[PDB]
Amino acid sequence: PKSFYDAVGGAKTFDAIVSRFYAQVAEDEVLRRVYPEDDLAGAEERLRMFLEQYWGGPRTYSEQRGHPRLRMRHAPFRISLIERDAWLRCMHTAVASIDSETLDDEHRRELLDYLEMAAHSLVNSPF
Template identity: 35%
Template sequence: MEELPNIYERLGADNLQLLVDYFYDLVFTDEQLAPLFSNTPKEVIKNKQLLFLTQFLGGPGAYSELYGHPKMRARHMPHEITESKAIAWLQCMNKAVYRLPIDEQLKKDLFSAFPKMAFHMVNTEK
């Protein structure tokens, strides 16, 4: 039986780069999210996200090779992540996904990969 392509294979590296670019254009101007990223150069943030999403969506594991196991919740613990910030993050991701030049089903499949992860990052009640 032939294995179906994963989201990374269906999306492709070029569209994933577009997603990261669109997403951070929104994040860096979002009043709730922008302060979370103020201490690191934007290109460093975008590159790490690209490597992480490549691996998260089923592509090569370059993130783990460079930075070790993702441990995303632990890496985000120094930052105050509220439910409202998780929702803002998801809204930015949703807008970025739906700007991509891909078919509607892939947009749905791609976005559906994010809500569980976003809410898993919440570490502060407000």
């Protein structure tokens, strides 16, 4: 279709990204100890639902979670440039794992531009 979500391959693509992302998080010395060790599956699910929604996919995230209120969702954690950069490192790996046939050069840039902006907007701590 027309939606960014469908253009990039819909649910299959977002599951692939968020899934490979959280696998990176597991091996990430920084983020390993940020994400609640006991709730890894649920965390992945919420991030996927959110990104699906954001890019014009299902609006399930909002029905389940409310307005994103990301600032307040991340308030429990001390996110400095170090966490921001680790998150982006993991996400860049995840996104780079998607072939160019599925994910355009134009769609890739748009996505990465958003992620880069969003991650910085959520920094809430000097260390």
